[PDB]
RNA sequence: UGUGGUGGCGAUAGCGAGAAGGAUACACCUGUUCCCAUGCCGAACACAGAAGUUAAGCUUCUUAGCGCCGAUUGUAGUGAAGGGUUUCCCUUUGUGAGAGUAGGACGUCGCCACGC
RNA sequence: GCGGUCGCCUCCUAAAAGGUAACGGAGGCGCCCAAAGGUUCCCUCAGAAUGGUUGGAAAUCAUUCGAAGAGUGUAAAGGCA
RNA sequence: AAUAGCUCACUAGUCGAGUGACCCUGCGCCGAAAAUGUACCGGGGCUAAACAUAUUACCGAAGCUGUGGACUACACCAUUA
RNA sequence: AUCCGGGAGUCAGACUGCGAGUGAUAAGAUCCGUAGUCGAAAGGGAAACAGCCCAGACCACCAGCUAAGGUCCCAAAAUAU
């Protein structure tokens, strides 16, 4: 219902290698009303939605306010790791 | 000296390659598969030995998937021949495998026989492996 | 026991003046073999598909929509 | 603005960009000061000689 | 203002699909005597005409099925600094694609004439 | 030493200006055409599907789909509807 | 040669706190055998005098500065130079 | 930096970091691009060591500050927090 929405900057250059060794999610969103921002995630909040509902869920993203229903495109892995990278979101309405 | 699989030529000698890294290239056929998580050449004969170590635990069913194929060719000179003249006659058909890629896949058999056959395979390949399902899809069906 | 080791000389193609220059009459701009860039204003084509500048002026490059490019000289 | 510029490392064994960009500024010996304004040419000098020069402001 | 002629601008201008029209204009159609023509053939090409038809071409309108143009964001790759095995990998600093997308989009501008 | 090679032209190696070696990896040349040249007009290919006597997978035909999958005297690139 | 097998299932038949199964990661172990004498820490030696994360002090060169002498070049200042 | 003249040397190069080739993606191998040092470079460090990390000596002094690398004893500096 209420995941972790923490904003980012335009080009955080190669500090993102340290974001691999600390358990962080560099994540995309682009959708219907509000165009595009990069947002933090931490990996222990999807698994309630994952192992409760499945793969066609409704994530209710926040702007620290009213919710935004998304229609998840890719939440993929990296090789040899099993963690969250290149997580292309997508959001169409009800 | 058993080669299962070859090409049709179009060029004899090829440049010895240079492999660094890969990613993705996941399970798509199946339900149980390896992951070569180093980088090496893998010849013909290793894939024969991997076939047979698969299939002698695949009795009456269960699909075998071979996803890697020897395209390129090595060459070698003789012993007693100096350095010098042109490239020696090609003997062998070897393809590279980087990290990430998947050696073989299985489906149609429960988990225990699957991990048996996959550890029978991975003692015949020079790369450290793992074992990965077709873990999650948008529709697993 | 090798039957190789044969080459041609290098014949040094490529653009021989940039944009924004001041270019005198009849000097080569972009030597080709095969038409890769067509001429525009004040630029002609020799026997081996080279590109002159007929009038003194400034070389500037253009493009014909999607496929191929142009050279043209404007005095200033 | 104004920027103070000093060598605090040798020039030896580093390529022909960095020698010549040093000689363009007026840095002859080690620990020699040069005071120059803040354009965007001189900032471009410092962003390639960052690993040889300590820069302060005036 | 309709129609015809005629130009540039990256197909965002296109392709497929559907509907409507003949005031003028355009087009089909009638014919070959004449300039003219077919390696055979008035199909074209060329020249005479005007019984009719909007069926086709053409013009206007609808449409996101194929094609086109697609931001931001994440990643591979890499200049400059560094560190380990030295086959290869990793860290700071600058720059970032290709795919995959939200989306835009069933044109825009200029001139002359005729009819109204 | 015995073998192979010695001039010229294309491609790759060649690190996206140009240049760059090896007894590195691939092919041609020591000509031809009095029209295969100049100009002025006109024109658009390879295939596939469906029918039609000899007539056959594959001749001459006919309609439709068809941006190139063809041709360019000759090796290879770059071009050309 | 069947066949006894804490009655290889249970009775809380007893006593009265935790006991299994997977992954991911930091540091180790085995795997590890050659020729004059220890014999790849430089030696001594070390349970930190090893490693990992952070913080100040200090040692360290013909590098830099301090006082002085010489030479060359451009200058200043005033004849002289 | 260019132009005009007077006078030479050089045409055997090495290794290291990075792109490639032949080789067995073997060699202090061989052959090319690209940067540094050595050749023509003394001083400090890696025990000793042309090519690796720091740094380019006009000369004197029993003065001072740091680099690379270090601080229990040979051997100068923490038995540091």
PDB file of C-alpha atoms (C1' of nucleotides) in Angstrom, chain E residues 2-105:
ATOM      1  C1'   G E   2     -14.558  25.413 -53.243  1.00  0.00           C
ATOM      2  C1'   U E   3     -11.502  23.591 -57.266  1.00  0.00           C
ATOM      3  C1'   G E   4      -7.159  23.412 -60.370  1.00  0.00           C
ATOM      4  C1'   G E   5      -2.125  24.562 -61.200  1.00  0.00           C
ATOM      5  C1'   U E   6       2.357  25.100 -58.583  1.00  0.00           C
ATOM      6  C1'   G E   7       6.653  25.205 -54.474  1.00  0.00           C
ATOM      7  C1'   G E   8       9.792  24.370 -50.018  1.00  0.00           C
ATOM      8  C1'   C E   9       9.879  21.734 -44.734  1.00  0.00           C
ATOM      9  C1'   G E  10      13.506  14.820 -42.043  1.00  0.00           C
ATOM     10  C1'   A E  11       6.836   9.898 -43.535  1.00  0.00           C
ATOM     11  C1'   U E  12       4.744  13.746 -36.995  1.00  0.00           C
ATOM     12  C1'   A E  13       3.665  14.395 -44.615  1.00  0.00           C
ATOM     13  C1'   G E  14       3.214   7.545 -45.167  1.00  0.00           C
ATOM     14  C1'   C E  15       0.517   2.480 -45.871  1.00  0.00           C
ATOM     15  C1'   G E  16      -3.879  -0.221 -44.836  1.00  0.00           C
ATOM     16  C1'   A E  17      -9.461   0.371 -43.594  1.00  0.00           C
ATOM     17  C1'   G E  18     -14.381   3.175 -44.071  1.00  0.00           C
ATOM     18  C1'   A E  19     -17.857   7.138 -45.796  1.00  0.00           C
ATOM     19  C1'   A E  20     -19.361  11.217 -48.925  1.00  0.00           C
ATOM     20  C1'   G E  21     -18.988  14.534 -54.249  1.00  0.00           C
ATOM     21  C1'   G E  22     -19.396  16.636 -59.723  1.00  0.00           C
ATOM     22  C1'   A E  23     -21.656  24.876 -59.748  1.00  0.00           C
ATOM     23  C1'   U E  24     -16.766  25.378 -62.232  1.00  0.00           C
ATOM     24  C1'   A E  25     -12.575  22.550 -62.859  1.00  0.00           C
ATOM     25  C1'   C E  26     -10.243  17.453 -63.340  1.00  0.00           C
ATOM     26  C1'   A E  27     -10.870  12.584 -64.982  1.00  0.00           C
ATOM     27  C1'   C E  28     -13.175   8.419 -67.576  1.00  0.00           C
ATOM     28  C1'   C E  29     -15.358   7.825 -72.106  1.00  0.00           C
ATOM     29  C1'   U E  30     -16.474   8.661 -78.545  1.00  0.00           C
ATOM     30  C1'   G E  31     -13.367   8.335 -82.858  1.00  0.00           C
ATOM     31  C1'   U E  32      -9.277   8.491 -86.361  1.00  0.00           C
ATOM     32  C1'   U E  33     -10.001  11.928 -91.546  1.00  0.00           C
ATOM     33  C1'   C E  34      -5.150  15.166 -90.555  1.00  0.00           C
ATOM     34  C1'   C E  35       0.591  16.341 -87.761  1.00  0.00           C
ATOM     35  C1'   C E  36       1.960  11.609 -85.399  1.00  0.00           C
ATOM     36  C1'   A E  37       2.581   6.197 -83.707  1.00  0.00           C
ATOM     37  C1'   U E  38       2.967   0.605 -82.647  1.00  0.00           C
ATOM     38  C1'   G E  39       9.888  -4.020 -83.539  1.00  0.00           C
ATOM     39  C1'   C E  40       1.918  -6.596 -84.023  1.00  0.00           C
ATOM     40  C1'   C E  41      -1.955  -3.937 -81.425  1.00  0.00           C
ATOM     41  C1'   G E  42      -5.057   4.361 -81.523  1.00  0.00           C
ATOM     42  C1'   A E  43      -3.447   0.100 -74.635  1.00  0.00           C
ATOM     43  C1'   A E  44       0.065   4.172 -74.301  1.00  0.00           C
ATOM     44  C1'   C E  45       2.142   7.705 -77.507  1.00  0.00           C
ATOM     45  C1'   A E  46      -0.405  12.056 -81.168  1.00  0.00           C
ATOM     46  C1'   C E  47      -4.671  14.602 -83.001  1.00  0.00           C
ATOM     47  C1'   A E  48      -9.777  15.562 -83.808  1.00  0.00           C
ATOM     48  C1'   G E  49     -14.649  15.717 -80.347  1.00  0.00           C
ATOM     49  C1'   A E  50     -18.428  15.791 -76.042  1.00  0.00           C
ATOM     50  C1'   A E  51     -23.899  10.786 -75.740  1.00  0.00           C
ATOM     51  C1'   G E  52     -23.068   9.860 -70.392  1.00  0.00           C
ATOM     52  C1'   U E  53     -21.301   8.210 -65.812  1.00  0.00           C
ATOM     53  C1'   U E  54     -19.185   9.958 -60.386  1.00  0.00           C
ATOM     54  C1'   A E  55     -17.931   3.264 -60.706  1.00  0.00           C
ATOM     55  C1'   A E  56     -12.383   4.257 -60.840  1.00  0.00           C
ATOM     56  C1'   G E  57      -8.478   8.277 -60.489  1.00  0.00           C
ATOM     57  C1'   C E  58      -8.942  13.014 -57.832  1.00  0.00           C
ATOM     58  C1'   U E  59     -10.927  16.122 -53.390  1.00  0.00           C
ATOM     59  C1'   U E  60     -13.096  16.277 -48.221  1.00  0.00           C
ATOM     60  C1'   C E  61     -14.031  13.687 -43.521  1.00  0.00           C
ATOM     61  C1'   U E  62     -13.319   9.346 -39.761  1.00  0.00           C
ATOM     62  C1'   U E  63      -9.526   5.577 -37.751  1.00  0.00           C
ATOM     63  C1'   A E  64      -3.832   4.577 -33.891  1.00  0.00           C
ATOM     64  C1'   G E  65      -4.021  -2.086 -37.275  1.00  0.00           C
ATOM     65  C1'   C E  66       1.529  -1.751 -40.050  1.00  0.00           C
ATOM     66  C1'   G E  67       5.283   2.087 -40.496  1.00  0.00           C
ATOM     67  C1'   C E  68       7.561   7.132 -38.539  1.00  0.00           C
ATOM     68  C1'   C E  69       9.117  10.700 -34.561  1.00  0.00           C
ATOM     69  C1'   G E  70       9.658   9.767 -29.508  1.00  0.00           C
ATOM     70  C1'   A E  71      11.341  12.711 -23.262  1.00  0.00           C
ATOM     71  C1'   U E  72      12.885  11.507 -18.357  1.00  0.00           C
ATOM     72  C1'   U E  73      14.935   7.513 -15.771  1.00  0.00           C
ATOM     73  C1'   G E  74      18.240   2.547 -14.939  1.00  0.00           C
ATOM     74  C1'   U E  75      22.370  -0.266 -17.006  1.00  0.00           C
ATOM     75  C1'   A E  76      26.377  -1.842 -20.207  1.00  0.00           C
ATOM     76  C1'   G E  77      30.797   1.015 -22.290  1.00  0.00           C
ATOM     77  C1'   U E  78      34.757   5.023 -21.159  1.00  0.00           C
ATOM     78  C1'   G E  79      38.419   9.857 -20.539  1.00  0.00           C
ATOM     79  C1'   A E  80      41.133  11.299 -16.216  1.00  0.00           C
ATOM     80  C1'   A E  81      42.849   9.658 -11.068  1.00  0.00           C
ATOM     81  C1'   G E  82      43.753   4.840  -7.922  1.00  0.00           C
ATOM     82  C1'   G E  83      44.110  -0.434  -5.796  1.00  0.00           C
ATOM     83  C1'   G E  84      44.490  -6.017  -5.982  1.00  0.00           C
ATOM     84  C1'   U E  85      45.237 -10.871  -9.086  1.00  0.00           C
ATOM     85  C1'   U E  86      47.921  -9.356 -13.083  1.00  0.00           C
ATOM     86  C1'   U E  87      44.650 -14.208 -17.731  1.00  0.00           C
ATOM     87  C1'   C E  88      40.921 -10.287 -15.054  1.00  0.00           C
ATOM     88  C1'   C E  89      38.288  -7.437 -11.389  1.00  0.00           C
ATOM     89  C1'   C E  90      37.084  -3.406  -8.099  1.00  0.00           C
ATOM     90  C1'   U E  91      36.694   2.132  -5.958  1.00  0.00           C
ATOM     91  C1'   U E  92      36.220   7.766  -6.487  1.00  0.00           C
ATOM     92  C1'   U E  93      35.577  11.504 -10.357  1.00  0.00           C
ATOM     93  C1'   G E  94      33.245  13.357 -15.695  1.00  0.00           C
ATOM     94  C1'   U E  95      30.391  11.850 -19.530  1.00  0.00           C
ATOM     95  C1'   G E  96      26.626   8.560 -21.360  1.00  0.00           C
ATOM     96  C1'   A E  97      24.213   5.207 -25.104  1.00  0.00           C
ATOM     97  C1'   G E  98      21.472   0.438 -27.722  1.00  0.00           C
ATOM     98  C1'   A E  99      17.045  -1.993 -26.157  1.00  0.00           C
ATOM     99  C1'   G E 100      12.364  -1.259 -23.428  1.00  0.00           C
ATOM    100  C1'   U E 101       8.550   2.933 -22.779  1.00  0.00           C
ATOM    101  C1'   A E 102       5.230   6.957 -21.131  1.00  0.00           C
ATOM    102  C1'   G E 103       3.897  10.048 -25.124  1.00  0.00           C
ATOM    103  C1'   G E 104       3.295  13.242 -30.061  1.00  0.00           C
ATOM    104  C1'   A E 105       1.168  12.265 -34.567  1.00  0.00           C
TER     105        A E 105
END
